[PDB]
């Protein structure tokens, strides 16, 4: 995407994650396991919900074309009415389509931003105790069990662990 | 050798959206917001039945055209419906002065 | 036909909840705003893979 995470430096998405748009997949002696980073997923869910609410409520006074009947010698005023309603409906269709397109763009890029930001959050803690394998994974230079991974998830990784 | 990996959700979906820079982008879950289906039946409005003028024009109903005895007595309505080109009209020819203005007034009664 | 709906168009009724529609300009009821488009999909998820 615009930030390079989705279909970028991370190859593709995990079918095995069902409870979050983003997450971790840890593998140590205590097994492997997926986990959802709930907080970032909630940021994204709020984003999308507020976007849908905005789309619904920002065009809640659009235009209502009520019908007016005219005789045969009021062709001018009838045509005025006709092309007026036509023009209003055209401009409001334009507005709806632009909103839909621009929001699709911003939303896809928002998700990309969230993935890149999560990768950066992990990297900024793991600074030197680990090494980037280039595709979204981090190799731990020390031994660290499931509570290590939990401290990484909730954001409290303790840097003093000897790593050689 | 422990290792942690970061990834994102995906699935076997096909629902496609459009972007201003790209067409037919496939996403995971998308919400349609446009309605395209109707039933084709002139159904009641908030329970109060319309006044479906079967074959009369507004002028015929108001004046009381003999072929319009369906509408000697009308109950309250919600909206008046008439054909595009009625056939029961001012049966005796002529005109209805400021016809359309009376139609406009009807649109509020 | 013997129905009951909360919106009416000269070519059918709309028992729908979406914010937009493209049936016919002239309506009456608490029904959505007319739009001249054939598709309005909004992306909630993220790009598939």
């Amino acid at each position: 995407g615009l930030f390079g995470a989705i279909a970028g430096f991370i190859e593709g998405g995990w079918q095995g994650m069902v409870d979050g748009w983003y997450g971790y997949h840890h593998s140590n002696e205590q097994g492997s396991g997926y986990a959802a980073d709930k907080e970032s997923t909630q940021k994204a869910i709020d984003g999308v919900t507020n976007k849908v609410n905005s789309i619904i409520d920002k065009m809640n006074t659009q235009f209502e074309a009520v019908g007016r009947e005219f005789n045969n010698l009021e062709r001018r005023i009838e045509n005025l009415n006709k092309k007026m309603e036509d023009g209003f409906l055209d401009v409001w269709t334009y507005n709806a389509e632009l909103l839909v397109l621009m929001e699709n763009e911003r939303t896809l890029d928002f998700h990309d931003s969230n993935v890149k930001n999560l990768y950066d959050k992990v990297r900024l803690q793991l600074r030197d105790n680990a090494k980037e394998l280039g595709n979204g994974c981090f190799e731990f230079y020390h031994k660290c069990d499931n509570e290590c991974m939990e401290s990484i998830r909730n954001g409290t990784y303790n840097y003093p662990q000897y790593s050689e | 050798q422990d290792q942690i990996c970061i990834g994102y959700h995906a699935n076997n979906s096909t629902e496609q959206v459009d972007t201003i820079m790209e067409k037919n982008v496939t996403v995971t879950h998308a919400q349609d917001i446009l309605e395209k289906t109707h039933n084709g039946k002139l159904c009641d409005l908030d329970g109060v039945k319309p006044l479906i003028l079967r074959d009369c024009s507004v002028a015929g109903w108001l004046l009381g055209n003999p072929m319009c005895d369906e509408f000697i007595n009308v109950p309250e309505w919600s909206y008046i419906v008439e054909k595009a080109n009625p056939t029961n009209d001012l049966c005796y020819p002529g005109s209805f002065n400021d016809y359309e203005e009376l139609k406009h007034l009807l649109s509020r009664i | 036909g013997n129905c009951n709906t909360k919106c009416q168009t000269p070519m059918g009724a709309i028992n729908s909840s979406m914010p937009f529609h493209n049936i016919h300009p002239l309506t009456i009821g608490e029904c959505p705003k007319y739009v001249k488009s054939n598709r309005l999909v909004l992306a909630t998820g993220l790009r598939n893979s």
Partner: antibody
Amino acid sequence: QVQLQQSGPGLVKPSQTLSLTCGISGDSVSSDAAAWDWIRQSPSRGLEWLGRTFYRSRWHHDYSESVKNRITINADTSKNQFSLQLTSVTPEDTATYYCARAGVRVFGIIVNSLDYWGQGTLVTVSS
Amino acid sequence: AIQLTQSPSSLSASVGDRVTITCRASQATSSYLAWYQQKPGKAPKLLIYAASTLQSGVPSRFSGSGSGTDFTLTITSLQPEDFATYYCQLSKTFGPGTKVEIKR
């Protein structure tokens, strides 16, 4: 609508193999819009999430931490059922086990809030 | 992992009286939260999910609200059938549960 009907022996010898089986009616265990969880409730521990399975492209198993390597959940489409298989049972497992269908979503993603439940199977371990 | 607290640990009110329960999560994930009811001897029964949305088939007398770390479940007029143990869950973990007792 949906129905989950549980079965399995209520008495299981210590350190032996516990095995419950939740038969489904009204949907498909191969549904792409749900997941199938196993929960346990005890007066001491309350409700605890044990395990989960689902199907997107392969069969996915999501187990808990209190049952690391101690649990296995299977889905059999031939009978439309899914099965809980818990090894090395100890006295701490005496509880009521529920099979649930996690499947109320919010923008397509499954929050895990259980949606339908089985009538529960009480299970005690003893000598 | 995540730890939930639930308050009060028990209560007692009469029919008709409005009661409220609070589930405090250490995390703010607004939706992912869900309130279940448990009568004695029966499995839970999902009442509210996403902390403000109601499951189909539940009487309207329940209502979920709140955000940040504090979520609330409000019952407007109790019933002899609402006597129960109410649980709140955060995506995989259930709160200890409160006991709604009928005072008469």
